[PDB]
Design a protein around this ligand. Structure first.
Ligand code: A1A9G
Ligand code: CL
Length: 167
């Protein structure tokens, strides 16, 4: 039993809800919140920009130190950093950004990072400003993640379409 409330069960372990991931994280304070990161951990917009804003830019400061030490992430890769005031940890995961010409097959590799954590609050990878088909992102999530994932979808119109089109 966990404190995630109001989710629709798509599968044994995949759940979905229309919610602002920032407001969800602030309410639940999950062990792991997933960020829709880029390889430079530059959290300028989308989910990443909103999560970083909610930390008063502390996420960006920590991320800049991480990059200075370790260099960029790989597309499909991840790193674990602090969750600041939002969660215990933030799993920064880089899905392919279609608007940069990155291979959509890497979306499965990106979701595989979730399997290293028993429970996560997450957005749909490569959706939104990363330019992939969100119905596809949900399909890959359900077919790749085996741990318990609570998916937050900000756009209500999109949420209804994902549910009604889910197989
Ligand atoms: O796949 C990422 C989704 C994309 C979907 O389509 C257009 C907007 O929402 N973005 C978000 N999902 C959850 N919380 C969020 N906070 C800020 C952005 C955001
Ligand atoms: Cl987005």
């Amino acid at each position: 039993v966990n404190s995630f409330s109001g989710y629709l069960k798509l599968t044994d372990n995949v759940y979905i809800k229309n919610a602002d991931i920032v407001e969800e994280a602030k309410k639940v304070k999950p062990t792991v919140v997933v960020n829709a990161a880029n390889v430079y951990l530059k959290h300028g917009g989308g989910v990443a920009g909103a999560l970083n804003k909610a930390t008063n830019n502390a996420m960006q400061v920590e991320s800049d130190d991480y990059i200075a030490t370790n260099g960029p992430l790989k597309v499909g890769g991840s790193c674990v950093l602090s969750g600041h005031n939002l969660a215990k940890h933030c799993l920064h995961v880089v899905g392919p950004n279609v608007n940069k010409g990155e291979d959509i097959q890497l979306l499965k590799s990106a979701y595989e990072n979730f399997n290293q954590h028993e429970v996560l609050l997450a957005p749909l990878l490569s959706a939104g400003i990363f330019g992939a088909d969100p119905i596809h992102s949900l399909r890959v999530c359900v077919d790749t993640v085996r741990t318990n994932v609570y998916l937050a979808v900000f756009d209500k119109n999109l949420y209804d379409k994902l549910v009604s089109s889910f197989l």
